[PDB]
Amino acid sequence: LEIPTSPLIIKITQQERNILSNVGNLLVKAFGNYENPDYIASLHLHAFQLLPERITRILSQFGSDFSAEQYGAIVFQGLIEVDQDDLGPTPPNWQGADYGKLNKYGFICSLLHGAVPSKPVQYYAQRKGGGLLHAVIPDEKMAATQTGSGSKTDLFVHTEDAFLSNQADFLSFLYLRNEERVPSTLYSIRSHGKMNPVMKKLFEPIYQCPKDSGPTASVLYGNRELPFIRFDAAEQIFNENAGQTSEALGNLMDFWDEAKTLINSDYIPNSGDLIFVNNHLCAHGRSAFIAGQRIENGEIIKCERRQMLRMMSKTSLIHIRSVTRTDDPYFIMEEHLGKIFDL
């Protein structure tokens, strides 16, 4: 067995970039925006017929691959060319993001999910939905917070929405700018190799999964030999109010001791790179940084602040139907491990 220790790196070609750009422009003209219900209803058809064939091939293989060799993450290097002057300055927070300008990017991202095949969704748990595409921008007000609006966060990893029974199946992180040169940290449950006694204890449904007395869940699930994972190191372990039992905390600490040595922080994304993640296999994180600066040869180089676009998707609308809005089967109303928001 070749135990995966790093994600698959795909170097996007100029011809592929040009196709994505032209297709993105055509979809903007045809449908106005990526949230158009006519576009969403025919998403897979546009994904398989408009994407560069190599991307379609990679994503289709990835969607059904839960084998021992699968890391659960793909880095698409140079997926898009970002014109930095046209993008202009990074807004102070995510509320300031111009969606007229990210519209083409939303089409491209939604086609990638569509080729898995997977359906872009939104969660009331994250920004009261906030649309299919989220701008992730470091806010000075929330500088050292354990969120996406954060800047100084270090050594931790998490799968997205570990507190939800219906968390995303697939995630995409499109980097518009990373002038601070912050590494993108990834962690795969497949990096452990063969099922061992430390991992086996995580199948027990005894762990707290606190929201971004509570119900418990298993950290490991799915296949017994090649499992899926729901994990949040900061929220389940290093949170004083996590409320874990001594048995559960001990199991998580033993797991974290093994897991932390397998974290991969080698990849530093460039503008236009997209990281595509199987949220059931691979956890993600970000190293500490001061937004709007980098240090080179003992000197501070001022720069525009970090800017990333996030899209989440589910492979089945049927199995999430008891937690979605009556008039919107793509809008998840789940609050915490089965419990729905009481509005």
Binds ligand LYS (CB under 6 A): choice among 71, 173, 228, 231: 173
Tokens read off for 29: 């003209």
- By CB under 6 A, which span of 11-19, 144-152, 243-251, 326-334 interacts with ligand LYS? 144-152
Residues touching ligand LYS: how many (CB under 6 A)?
Answer: 15
Q: Is 128 in the site for ligand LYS (CB under 6 A)?
A: no
Q: Is 149 in the site for ligand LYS (CB under 6 A)?
A: yes
Q: Could you give the angle at which helices 99-114 and 14-31 cross, rounded to 10 degrees? A: 110
Helices of type H across 51-184: 53-63, 84-87, 99-114
Tokens read off for 80: 């898009």
Binds ligand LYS (CB under 6 A): choice among 178, 184, 264, 307: 184
Touching ligand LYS, residues 89-118 (CB under 6 A): 94
* Other beta carbons within 10 Å of 1: 9
Separation between Cα atoms, residue 232 and residue 166, nearest integer Å: 15
Task: Please answer whether residues 30 and 97 qualify as being in contact, where contact means their C-beta atoms are separated by less than 8 angstroms.
Answer: no
- Give 232's DSSP letter: B
Binds ligand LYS (CB under 6 A): choice among 104, 284, 314, 336: 284
Amino acid at 200: K
Binds ligand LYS (CB under 6 A): choice among 127, 224, 319, 325: 127
296 is in an annotated binding site: no
CA angle 170, 171, 177 (to 5 degrees): 160
Binds ligand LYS (CB under 6 A): choice among 95, 147, 245, 293: 147
Least CB distance from residue 161 to ligand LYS, whole Å? 8
Least CB distance from residue 136 to ligand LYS, whole Å? 5
Amino acid at 231: F
**At which residue do the structure tokens 């083409």 appear?**
104
- By CB under 6 A, which span of 85-93, 108-116, 282-290, 316-324 interacts with ligand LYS? 282-290
Which residues share a beta bridge with 217?
Answer: 207
Q: Is 70 in the site for ligand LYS (CB under 6 A)?
A: no
Separation between Cα atoms, residue 14 and residue 272, nearest integer Å: 12
Separation between Cα atoms, residue 244 and residue 74, nearest integer Å: 33
- For residue 91, cis peptide bond before it (omega within 30 degrees of 0): no
Least CB distance from residue 267 to ligand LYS, whole Å? 9
Q: Is 171 in the site for ligand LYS (CB under 6 A)?
A: no
**Who contacts 322 (Cβ-Cβ below 8 Å, separation ≥6)?**
none
Q: Is 136 in the site for ligand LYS (CB under 6 A)?
A: yes
Q: Is 150 in the site for ligand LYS (CB under 6 A)?
A: yes
Which of 127, 321 has the CB closer to ligand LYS? 127
Q: Is 72 in the site for ligand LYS (CB under 6 A)?
A: no
State residue 293 phi and psi, 5-degree precision: -160, 155
158 is in an annotated binding site: yes
Quick check: helix, strand or coil at residue 253?
helix
Binds ligand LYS (CB under 6 A): choice among 106, 114, 129, 285: 285
160 is in an annotated binding site: yes
- Which residues participate in the annotated binding site for Fe cation? 158, 160, 284
User: Which residues contact ligand LYS by CB under 6 A?
Assistant: 94, 126-127, 136, 147-150, 173, 184-185, 284-286, 308
- Which residues participate in the annotated binding site? 158, 160, 284
